[PDB]
């Protein structure tokens, strides 16, 4: 079990590494697929990729000999990365929602709108957030519970448990996670709702000819929303509940388990490639990518 | 299989009239763009206008005014009603559906093509 446990975190890191690698070498090499809504897929890629190369990495030797082996100011530097990397990718999946909603259905709107400038504000927008809600605190310990067992482990090198207080605890997981699942179910549901009652005008214009149904077009594109919706949901929701949960009753839920989440939430950095791009522009990039 | 089937172009004198249509047959998502693009001789392809699902239009300058593009509330069929025809606007135009179906991305089909051309 301990054997395959270390095993599948490895192909974890591949696939992430080789996936985000493979989609910023796309966008970067092909004048055709560098388009408004790619920059936002570019600063996901960006994020999951620094989950890939380092967070998970230093993570998985943590599990492995059980002990944290480079000392207290990386165990700081590293938590913060992987806050900042966590937030910067879910924030990211949030403002990807909102621009195909607009671009679907809002698409003269959002041209103007939307200028290539006003994205980067954006985009930089979420790294700063992601940055002020890991790097300032937890490097200020601002995030320091008070308890005496948990400043045990704050002067022991050997342990980089990530022990946090209430305040912290709440406003980081509504920040990194709950009020991007919000926004997501509320933009997503208003894609779903617009599509409905388009559907509704069709059938309107029929003077009582035909009712419509569900087509190749609508069975897929629901499918791809809930694809969207559920893998993110799937992956992040446990761990974001149960960092909650610890913050009431922390006996209730085991160690092994929280860790257990967090490790099905990296690897949702894996899926975004696959996922957000499927593209036909993609296809052909990652063809002529392998040689 | 998607197919698009424009008519209604062809000969016409300048300050004339032409009206347009693309018979869009098979499966597109709800929400879309149906177009008209044209490329006049040894230029390139430009927006002429188009109308989102919704109802929402965007037309070119050099058009405004004079062309009107509106769509079939029933099938996928779009109807480009061309007025005051210059010699500028001789061009072979283009039928064009974005599908938004996959979300993420656009799919896009065009057109065969249509021969529009107006003498003075």
């Known amino acids: 079990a301990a054997k395959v446990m270390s095993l599948l975190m490895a192909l974890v890191v591949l696939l992430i590494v080789a996936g985000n690698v493979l989609v910023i070498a796309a966008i970067g090499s092909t004048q055709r697929l560098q388009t408004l809504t790619n920059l936002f897929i570019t600063s996901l890629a960006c994020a999951d990729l620094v989950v890939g190369l380092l967070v998970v990495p230093f993570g998985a030797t943590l599990v492995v000999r059980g002990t944290w082996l480079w000392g207290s100011f990386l165990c700081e530097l590293w938590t913060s990365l992987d806050v900042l990397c966590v937030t910067a990718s879910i924030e990211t999946l949030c403002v990807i929602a909102i621009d195909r909603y607009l671009a679907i259905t809002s698409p003269f709107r959002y041209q103007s709108l939307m200028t290539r400038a006003r994205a980067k504000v954006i985009i930089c927008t979420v790294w700063a957030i992601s940055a002020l809600v890991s790097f300032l605190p937890i490097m200020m310990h601002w995030w320091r519970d008070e308890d005496p067992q948990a400043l045990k482990c704050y002067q022991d090198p050997g342990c980089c448990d990530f022990v946090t207080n209430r305040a912290y605890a709440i406003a980081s997981s509504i920040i990194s996670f709950y009020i991007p699942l919000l926004i997501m179910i509320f933009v997503y549901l208003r894609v779903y709702r617009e599509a409905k009652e388009q559907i509704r005008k069709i059938d309107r214009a029929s003077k009582r000819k035909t009712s419509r149904v569900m087509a190749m077009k609508e069975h897929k594109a629901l499918k791809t929303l809930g694809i969207i919706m559920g893998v993110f949901t799937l992956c992040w929701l446990p761990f974001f509940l149960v960092n909650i949960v610890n913050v009431f009753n922390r006996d209730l839920v085991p160690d092994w388990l929280f860790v257990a989440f967090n490790w099905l939430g990296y690897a949702n950095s894996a899926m975004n490639p696959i996922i957000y791009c499927r593209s036909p522009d993609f296809r052909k990039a990652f063809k002529r990518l392998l040689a | 299989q998607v197919q698009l089937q424009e008519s209604g172009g062809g000969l016409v004198q300048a300050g004339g009239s032409l009206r347009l249509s693309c018979a869009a047959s098979?499966?597109?998502?709800?929400?879309?763009?149906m177009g008209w693009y044209r490329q006049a001789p040894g230029k390139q392809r430009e927006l002429v206008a188009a109308?989102?699902?919704?109802?929402?239009?965007n037309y070119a300058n050099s058009v405004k005014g004079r062309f009107t593009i509106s769509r079939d509330n029933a099938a996928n069929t779009v109807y480009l009603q061309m007025n005051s025809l210059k010699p500028e606007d001789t061009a072979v135009y283009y039928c064009?559906?974005?599908?938004?179906?996959?979300?993420?991305?656009?799919?896009?089909?065009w057109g065969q093509g249509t021969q529009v051309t107006v003498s003075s």
């Open positions: 109308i989102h699902s919704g109802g929402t239009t």
């Open positions: 064009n559906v974005k599908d938004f179906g996959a979300i993420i991305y656009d799919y896009d089909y």
């Open positions: 098979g499966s597109i998502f709800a929400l879309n763009i």
